[PDB]
């Protein structure tokens, strides 16, 4: 409840200076690698085998998985600099622009612009453009860097709206059986987007293209965090909201699915991070 | 000190049955899956992206990432039966046999024996046989049945002999430079058998065949343990006799091979595992 996480709009030009500095000393120690590694070896654990959920999507573990990912990827971050707290990315309100690719978030001073058409839509701008920042490929071997390509998608032209995200928060179960892609009214599918697809978490990372559009990959381009911030927060509302809901399923659900199964590739619990201020963190709209 | 680890010929019928009986259990609770996926996924992080070496193989990391890797593993065998340790194979002595696929290790009450050269080698004895025993490939995803092939590979047609070991232990330093399969005068990459390969560790796992045969897949046969337990004794002998030495590299090798570098998909260094005793166990031998 000490660290606050604020609106990436709402930074100081030296906030945004220092948050990607320590991002870049991460990826330079090989501690980055971890989290994209991480990230594709969950979206490649099955629960149960045969199924299409896995540990970290499609499933009601979505939610407090990548909670868990983004502490300890924001604990990384203190460790180089205890100042510095993970921002986060309010596409939502991006969407009310015609052209959202003209955000602040996408500025040379910050995450970089969009792909360059020229050279298969690779990202040349920023601080992660090829040439300063390596990216690899869905097999853990160097990929020739980042790529964007906003909105050139026919399932994900736009943004999510802020009608959207209320539309969401209207649900009051967090999730329903069979704990899937197929959940109907549940928080969560609704939040993931699933519901009449690709919606709000799914859509953005359809809109932006590149290694955001492909699971195994998505982690390469750093607004992903970014991203998985604002889900964290929308998340968080929701659970202030309907203080009296908690995590489905309890129990007999798949293994890595219920309220106090392990998550790989951790042995972190739903009930861990069910309580995102005991994790020692809130969200600057919380005050 | 107090967690003996036994040589599976030194075991009970009661000891070997009980062991069996906590391998299913895991299996079945959906725990054994991610030993299988934890292996696999640490195959696939390269240190650093572009190298042959990995987490768990081909480095300086092998030996102390599979200890921490079994060491997990007994743990949670004794979540479900407190009297059960992870037993070791000792294949050096199995070698000397004149027939090593009819050892007491491949009877029917405990791994099963050699695989059915008309099923295209599924195994149809023991408690791992084809209909009681699931198997995942290298995608995380069902496969067929558990394979094995004893020797009918002309790299390794006999297992690693006492002679190997003893030669291994004659070795002074833990590893060199470049840290990885060329590494020569080192411990660690004659212990893992990548000096005049197949040889020892890499040599056992070719001559079982099947998936144990490849490196992602290899967790699916339950040997897999009994196996690394063997190699895990071998390097606690050599620890023993050589108590001054250390492990290599201390530092400026890549990031997850030094000694205080967290071994994916761990934070666990290799420095918490130096030490089998202080982990809270030790082999038999030692008594
Ligand atoms: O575009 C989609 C989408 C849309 C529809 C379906 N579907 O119906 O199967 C499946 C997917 N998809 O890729 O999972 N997505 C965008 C990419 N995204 C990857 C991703 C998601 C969450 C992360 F933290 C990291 C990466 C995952 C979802
Ligand atoms: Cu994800
Ligand atoms: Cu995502
Ligand atoms: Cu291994
Ligand atoms: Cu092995």
Redesign the interface.
Known sequence: KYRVRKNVLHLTDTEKRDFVRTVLILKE???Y??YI??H??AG???????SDRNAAHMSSAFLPWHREYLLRFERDLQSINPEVTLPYWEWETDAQMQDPSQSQIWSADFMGGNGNPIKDFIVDTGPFAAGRW?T?DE????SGGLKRNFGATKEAPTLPTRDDVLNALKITQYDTPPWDMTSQNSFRNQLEGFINGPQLHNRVHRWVGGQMGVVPTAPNDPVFFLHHANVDRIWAVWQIIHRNQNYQPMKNG???QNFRD?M??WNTTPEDVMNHRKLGYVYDIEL
Chains 1, 2 share one sequence.
């Open positions: 120690k090989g501690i690698d971890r590694a991480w594709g070896a490649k654990f099955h629960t149960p085998p045969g390596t690899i097999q853990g071997n160097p798949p293994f890595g392990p790989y590739p």
